[PDB]
Design a protein around this ligand. Structure first.
Ligand SMILES: *[C@@H]1O[C@H](CO)[C@@H](O[C@@H]2O[C@H](CO)[C@@H](O)[C@H](O)[C@H]2NC(C)=O)[C@H](O)[C@H]1NC(C)=O
Lengths: 48, 48
C-alpha cells in the first residue's frame, strides 16, 4: 500500500515534468488548428 | 447591423461595432493572423 501510494503521488509530477507523452493530445489539437488556419489562409492566394 | 460595407474601396459584408483597437495614425484597416480583415478605419470620422 505504501509503495502504491508513493507511486500515485509521484504520478502528478511524472506527467507534467518528464514530458515524453502528453504531447500527442497537444499534437492532435495543434494539427487540427494548423490545418484550419492553412485552409483559411489559402483564401488570400491569387492562384495566378 | 449586418450590412454590405464599402470603406475606401475595401468591400465586404458584416456587422460593424465600436472598437477598442488603437490603430497607428497612418493605418487604414487591420487583419487577423490568417489575413482576414477585422477592423476598418472610417475615412470620414477616423473611427476604428
Ligand atoms: C469630412 O468632412 C467633414 C465636414 O463635412 C469634416 O469635419 C467634420 O465635420 C462635422 C460637421 O458636423 C463635425 O461634426 C465632425 O466632428 C468633423 N469631423 C472630424 C473628424 O473632425 C471631417 O473631418 C472630414 N473628414 C476628413 C477630413 O477625414
Amino acid at each position: 500500500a505504501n509503495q502504491f501510494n508513493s507511486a500515485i503521488g509521484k504520478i502528478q509530477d511524472s506527467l507534467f515534468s518528464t514530458a515524453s507523452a502528453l504531447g500527442k493530445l497537444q499534437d492532435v489539437v495543434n494539427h487540427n488548428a494548423q490545418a484550419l488556419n492553412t485552409l483559411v489562409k489559402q483564401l488570400s492566394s491569387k492562384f495566378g | 447591423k449586418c450590412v454590405n460595407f464599402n470603406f475606401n474601396g475595401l468591400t465586404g459584408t458584416g456587422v460593424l461595432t465600436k472598437s477598442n483597437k488603437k490603430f497607428l495614425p497612418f493605418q487604414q484597416f487591420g487583419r487577423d493572423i490568417v489575413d482576414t480583415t477585422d477592423a476598418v478605419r472610417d475615412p470620414q470620422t477616423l473611427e476604428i
